[PDB]
Design a binder for these strands. Structure first.
Ligand code: SAH
Lengths: 6, 17, 687
DNA sequence: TTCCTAATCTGAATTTA
DNA sequence: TAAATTCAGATTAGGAAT
């Protein structure tokens, strides 16, 4: 879906 | 009046004793 | 006023048929009721008795009313134990996640005493409470009296007792010898006890446990992190709720190089597993459906247990901060070292999960360090949680091992279950060590009056005469046995998985069938290597056999004046100075050679020859990892992983798997419902 | 009763790759 | 800074001598 890579 | 009182086989792990 | 006896005496021979040996105190006759200070007490009354100065008033139940042959007026009662009257003592003031010891909760015992009627004070209403009744039908009953008891206490093994799959959580699991033994013994007893979860903050121990148990969910983390992860896995199981994802791998709370909170491992679309990344939840907020899928399928697969999903919890919390080996311990307060507080964390997780059975294991100094503060703490945490409990001390060599490892084991069982016994010794042992005087009654052993013929005490040759020779540098994790097994113990230790009822790999032979695993010793540096080379191959040989060493007055080592300081090839002395200083210069341990007929009291995590006798009897090396695991009963197929030192640590911290296996058989018998009665000891069947 | 002695899932300070 | 090497305390149970 959608998220962050830090 | 006075006080009352409130009061063991050994184990054996070795072959003898 | 004078205490008096009330009513006609019991029939002369009826009193003898009820109390034969009373007719070492003899009685003229028996009665039924007695008055003291204008209150009549009948038989069976619960009574308060005057005790010593500063001592709380004793609590008893009257069993006879008789006039003594010395013309005195006696009564006799069997005592109720307060929670602090038991071995718990000062730790009656502790609380674990809410639960405290109820001041009105006593424990009936069969300990009896005779006193005079003048010791009696006033009646007390003590009701017997069934834990398996309606939970709110016990409330008003408890508040309708003065004291109450739901359990009996026995001095023998500190027993708190009542009046087919099963899941196991292994906390501080290590390489997994304890849980493996428990599962093996339970399978022998007819119970499918598996290990669903295992937590350990050492990575190589996790590697070993998952290798020998592929289906086990092994987590490389800490126990407090695991407990918080369970707490914040429950609410996701209740809610069911830069790049793009394909699936979520795992979940965690906190950890190394991370802050408190729930994190997910993420597999990103178009990227390999090497690019999978641990991420927080507030940064995964745009990924709701995949978190839903993860939570749902992990709940259906029970990757993490909810309260009620764990039937047995076993634990071997760190003893490095409790052992008599640690000369830096803090007796003044034991719950300062974190490794000591890990037992509190363990019992907190037990409180959160509420398993049917609990088995904590530690060493004997937990009953001696800080006068046993921590050990009793454990018992208290079980008693304050209404757990049936039991405490035992078991010697490893008594179950088929050439080593004398006395370990303390705390059984706990919910009141809906049967408290499991302790297995009697199946072997004789070479007694090397002393049990504490305050816990003499907690030694799991046969009494002196009766002991059947047990199998001969295993010696070291029975364990290692099979194995082929290896040098100081043995870099091979897998090799072959030089020949067939020689002794019965070696034949038992070379049994396959299915022959040992190990169902970890299902049917069909698993990995490393018939291979010799981890037969590698600690590679000593060149200096220690040639020091070992200089030790003679003889019984009793140690550093005192080196050049320039002498035994002076009162068995104290000195240097030989006629022989100059013997020097090694490196320019460092052949005989080290710490060898000369150790144990005020009176130790035989440094660079000691062990022999085939003498046992090893306790295998430890460090395998250096420096302050122990760990040198192989005929080879110029220390005992290999496989040999130490054999001394602790590990089956030969149980493969270890990691550096040689880490494998040594794994097998040295473990539980002797024969001990855990006997415990697992007892646990299975208690779990299925096959039990004899009140006896805390159990004789094992042929196994 | 004397001393010893044996025994304790090892840890920390220092020195050296 | 990490890795390797060197040294090391506090109790307590039992065991032989006498
Ligand atoms: N804070 C902590 N959190 C989790 N595990 C810890 C810990 N401190 C120590 N441990 C782990 O506790 C383990 C105790 S060893 C227990 C081995 C096991 N009973 C067996 O029979 O094989 C060690 O392996 C250690 O890595």
């Amino acid at each position: 879906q959608t998220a962050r890579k830090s | 009046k006075q006080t009352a009182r409130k009061s063991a086989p050994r184990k054996q792990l070795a072959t003898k004793a | 006023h004078e205490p008096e006896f009330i009513g006609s005496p019991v029939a002369a021979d009826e009193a003898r048929s009820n109390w034969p040996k009373r007719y070492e105190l003899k009685a003229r006759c028996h009665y039924r009721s007695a008055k003291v200070d204008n209150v009549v007490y009948c038989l069976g009354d619960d009574v308060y008795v005057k005790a010593g100065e500063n001592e709380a008033d004793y609590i008893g139940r009257i069993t006879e009313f008789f006039e003594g042959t010395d013309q005195c007026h006696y009564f006799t009662c069997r005592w109720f134990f307060r929670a602090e009257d038991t071995v718990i003592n000062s730790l009656v003031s502790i609380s674990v996640d809410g639960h405290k010891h109820d001041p009105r909760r006593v424990f009936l015992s069969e300990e009896k005493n005779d006193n005079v009627l003048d010791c009696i004070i006033s009646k007390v209403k003590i009701v017997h409470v069934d834990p398996n009744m309606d939970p709110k039908a016990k409330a008003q009953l408890i508040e309708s009296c003065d004291l109450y008891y739901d359990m009996s206490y026995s001095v023998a093994y500190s027993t708190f007792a009542n009046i087919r799959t099963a899941t196991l959580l292994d906390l501080y699991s290590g390489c997994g010898g304890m849980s493996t033994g428990l599962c093996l013994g339970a399978a022998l007893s007819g119970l499918k006890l598996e290990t669903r979860w295992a937590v350990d903050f050492n990575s190589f121990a996790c590697q070993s446990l998952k290798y020998n148990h592929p289906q086990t969910e092994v987590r490389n983390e800490k126990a407090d992190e695991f407990l918080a992860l369970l707490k914040e896995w429950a609410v996701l199981c209740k809610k069911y709720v830069e790049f793009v994802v394909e699936k979520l791998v795992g979940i965690c709370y906190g950890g190394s190089d991370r802050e408190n909170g729930i994190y997910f491992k993420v597999q990103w679309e178009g990227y390999g597993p090497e690019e999978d990344t641990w991420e927080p939840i507030d940064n995964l907020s745009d990924c709701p459906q995949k978190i839903r899928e993860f939570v749902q399928e992990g709940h259906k697969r029970k990757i993490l247990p909810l309260p009620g999903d764990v039937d047995v919890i076993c634990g071997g919390p760190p003893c490095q901060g409790i052992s008599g080996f640690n000369r830096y311990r803090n007796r003044d307060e034991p719950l300062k070292d974190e490794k000591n507080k890990q037992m509190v964390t363990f019992m907190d997780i037990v409180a959160y999960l509420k398993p049917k059975y609990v088995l904590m294991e530690n060493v004997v100094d937990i009953l001696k360090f800080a006068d046993g503060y921590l050990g009793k703490y454990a018992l208290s945490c079980l008693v304050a949680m209404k757990y049936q409990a039991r405490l035992g001390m078991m010697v490893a060599g008594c179950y088929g091992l050439p080593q004398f490892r006395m370990r303390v084991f705390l059984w706990g069982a919910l009141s809906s279950m049967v408290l499991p016994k302790y297995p009697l010794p199946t072997y004789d042992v070479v007694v090397r060590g002393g049990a504490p005087n305050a816990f003499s009654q907690c030694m799991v052993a046969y009494d002196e009056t009766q002991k059947p013929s047990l199998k001969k005490a295993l010696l070291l040759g029975d364990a290692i005469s099979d194995l082929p020779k290896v040098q100081n540098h043995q870099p091979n994790d897998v090799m072959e046995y030089g020949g067939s097994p020689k002794t019965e113990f070696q034949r038992y230790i070379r049994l396959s998985r299915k022959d040992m009822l190990d169902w970890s790999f299902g049917e069909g032979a698993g990995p490393d069938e018939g291979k010799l695993l981890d037969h590698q010793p600690l590679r000593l540096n060149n200096d220690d290597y040639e020091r070992v080379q200089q030790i003679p191959v003889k019984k009793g040989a140690n550093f005192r056999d080196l050049k320039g060493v002498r035994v002076g007055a009162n068995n104290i080592v000195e240097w030989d004046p006629e022989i100059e300081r013997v020097k090694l090839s490196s320019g460092k002395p052949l005989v080290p100075d710490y060898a000369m200083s150790f144990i005020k210069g009176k130790s035989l341990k440094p660079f000691g050679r062990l022999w085939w007929d003498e046992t090893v009291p306790t295998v430890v995590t460090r395998a250096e020859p420096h302050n122990q006798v760990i040198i192989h009897p005929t080879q110029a090396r220390v005992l290999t990892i496989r040999e130490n695991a054999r001394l602790q009963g590990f089956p030969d197929y149980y493969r270890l992983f990691g550096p040689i030192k880490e494998k040594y640590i794994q097998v040295g911290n473990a539980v002797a798997v024969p001990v855990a296996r006997a415990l697992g058989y007892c646990l299975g018998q208690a779990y299925l419902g096959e039990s004899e009665g009140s006896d805390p000891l159990y004789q094992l069947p042929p196994s």
